[PDB]
Design a protein around this ligand. Structure first.
Ligand SMILES: *[C@@H]1O[C@H](CO[C@@H]2O[C@@H](C)[C@@H](O)[C@@H](O)[C@@H]2O)[C@@H](O[C@@H]2O[C@H](CO)[C@@H](O[C@@H]3O[C@H](CO[C@H]4O[C@H](CO)[C@@H](O)[C@H](O)[C@@H]4O[C@@H]4O[C@H](CO)[C@@H](O[C@@H]5O[C@H](CO)[C@H](O)[C@H](O)[C@H]5O)[C@H](O)[C@H]4NC(C)=O)[C@@H](O)[C@H](O[C@H]4O[C@H](CO)[C@@H](O)[C@H](O)[C@@H]4O)[C@@H]3O)[C@H](O)[C@H]2NC(C)=O)[C@H](O)[C@H]1NC(C)=O
Ligand SMILES: *[C@@H]1O[C@H](CO[C@@H]2O[C@@H](C)[C@@H](O)[C@@H](O)[C@@H]2O)[C@@H](O[C@@H]2O[C@H](CO)[C@@H](O[C@@H]3O[C@H](CO[C@H]4O[C@H](CO)[C@@H](O)[C@H](O)[C@@H]4O[C@@H]4O[C@H](CO)[C@@H](O[C@@H]5O[C@H](CO)[C@H](O)[C@H](O)[C@H]5O)[C@H](O)[C@H]4NC(C)=O)[C@@H](O)[C@H](O[C@H]4O[C@H](CO)[C@@H](O)[C@H](O)[C@@H]4O)[C@@H]3O)[C@H](O)[C@H]2NC(C)=O)[C@H](O)[C@H]1NC(C)=O
Ligand SMILES: [Zn+2]
Ligand SMILES: [Zn+2]
Ligand SMILES: [Zn+2]
Ligand SMILES: [Zn+2]
Ligand SMILES: [Zn+2]
Ligand SMILES: [Zn+2]
Lengths: 207, 207
């Protein structure tokens, strides 16, 4: 019979009040002999009716796939409200329900530290600028780099790593020409996390 | 019918000539009506006969599981030899073969850089000592920390991250009391990777 998958919003969409987070309920392996699908949505057990269901789409394996999208409020998601998607179909002996929420647990604010290149690296043509983000909970987080009101995109960030105290840390590495570093430009590590003030902070790095 | 899984050696066992790396061929879902299992092992297509097969073990789901262990030579594994495990059984329409080798690709030597705590962190009771390992290929690697001929084990290391040039980097974070740092102890980041001389290097960090 059919299977249901319930997907959370994109993490950045939950941390920027200007964006619109949504949860996505996908049903797959709907058959042609029973193609009719009913979604019901609940927020903390209270049925809501503002979801937007897309029309069925036949797949190449002779099944149907159908998606319903529920917009969630910025504050509702961060305050831990629970979103339940119930999918009903004439082939199911009982409806299928799935519930999802923001990662649970007491929040912990990141500490953000920028580290200049190692003295041994200063001999190369490019240098690594390092941003350590530690002590945060939950692990949902975004990191980017900027300089002079422009995105610096030659960077990579590690996944969050579970630290010994139950919080998370990561590192972000930005690679720049040694000349840019020596000329004194200011680089900034930008971090978005639920437990920061306005879910945002910035730390800068320069010679 | 039966399924076969072929496991590589532990990465540290491949990088220390004093250790003994082995590949492990596991067969699961062997039935009771056909419990007889024959392993054949090949190194670069040449059959070898020094593997050590364990006796069948019944599982709680009324199947059998059987394991064969082939020791591999330090140099053979690092030189890219291919290990094939062939499993034969009266229930298979044809034998099952699985092949495994060290991660393939031109090797690249890690650059190892140690970074002292951020100036802003020096106000806390504990500080983070950072070891950046970058530019290495393949991603198999081990990292630990030492001080005064003793293991410093209050550390966490990120997984390898694919960098923009196709090599890998990671970071290791060692947490020590601020007093230990200020008292001038020497901490050392130890790295094992195939492309280092003797697959080993060390970098030290102190105030
Ligand atoms: C018949 O065909 C259908 C349709 O598909 C085939 O699909 C592919 C393979 C084609 O090449 C063709 O062969 C076919 O058309 C099959 O349907 C599939 O069923 C699978 C299970 O049977 C199911 O697997 C589960 O996948 C989950 C992850 O799905 C992600 O990522 C995959 C890529 O890896 C992608 O295919 C999915 O679409 C889905 O993508 C995410 O979707 C969400 C929702 O839209 C996105 O979230 C939104 O994103 C937007 C921006 O994009 C915005 O931020 C919104 O706010 C936000 O809400 C998200 O961004 C997408 N991510 C990406 C990367 O794209 C797994 O989690 C899941 O796992 C759990 O799985 C197992 C349990 O079953 C266990 O291993 C374990 O417990 C795990 O916890 C499954 O792996 C497929 O998703 C599903 N495919 C689709 C397209 O729906 C059907 O199976 C087949 N039937 C038969 C009988 O063969
Ligand atoms: C009937 O029962 C059997 C037996 O087991 C049940 O097992 C558990 C669940 C119990 O609670 C009971 O319920 C039962 O007894 C079932 O057999 C299982 O079949 C699975 C597939 O059907 C198979 O899944 C595959 O697992 C691979 C990973 O296995 C690892 O890790 C798991 C833990 O996650 C562990 O259970 C395994 O033993 C194995 O552990 C590794 O073993 C190797 C070899 O020993 C170790 O390597 C050696 O290590 C030593 C030091 O330890 C030294 O360094 C040596 O030099 C070195 O060689 C390694 O260290 C071990 N690691 C760990 C962490 O322990 C997956 O990779 C694999 O995946 C691919 O899988 C899918 C494809 O099928 C895809 O998703 C994808 O393509 C992936 O690429 C599978 O997930 C189980 O391993 C297997 N269990 C065992 C114990 O063998 C059987 O299924 C069941 N039948 C039925 C019909 O229900
Ligand atoms: Zn309604
Ligand atoms: Zn609940
Ligand atoms: Zn907010
Ligand atoms: Zn033999
Ligand atoms: Zn081959
Ligand atoms: Zn060697």
């Amino acid at each position: 019979g059919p299977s249901v998958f319930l997907f959370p919003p994109k993490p950045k969409d939950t941390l920027m009040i200007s964006r619109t987070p949504e949860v996505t309920c996908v049903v797959v392996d709907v058959s042609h002999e029973d193609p009719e699908v009913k979604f019901n949505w609940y927020v903390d057990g209270v049925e809501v009716h503002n979801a937007k269901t897309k029309p069925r789409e036949e797949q190449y394996n002779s099944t149907y796939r159908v998606v319903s999208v529920l917009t969630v409020l910025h504050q509702d998601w961060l305050n831990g409200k629970e979103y339940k998607c119930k999918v009903s179909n004439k082939a199911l002996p009982a409806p299928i329900e799935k519930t999802i929420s923001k990662a649970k647990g007491q929040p912990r604010e990141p500490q953000v530290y920028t580290l200049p290149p190692s003295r041994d690296e200063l001999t190369k043509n490019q240098v690594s600028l390092t941003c350590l983000v530690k002590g945060f909970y939950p692990s949902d987080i975004a990191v980017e780099w900027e300089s002079n009101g422009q995105p610096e995109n030659n960077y990579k960030t590690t996944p969050p790593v579970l630290d010994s105290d139950g919080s998370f840390f990561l590192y972000s590495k930005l690679t720049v020409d040694k000349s840019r570093w020596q000329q004194g430009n200011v680089f900034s590590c930008s971090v978005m996390h639920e437990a920061l003030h306005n879910h945002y902070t910035q730390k800068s790095l320069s010679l």
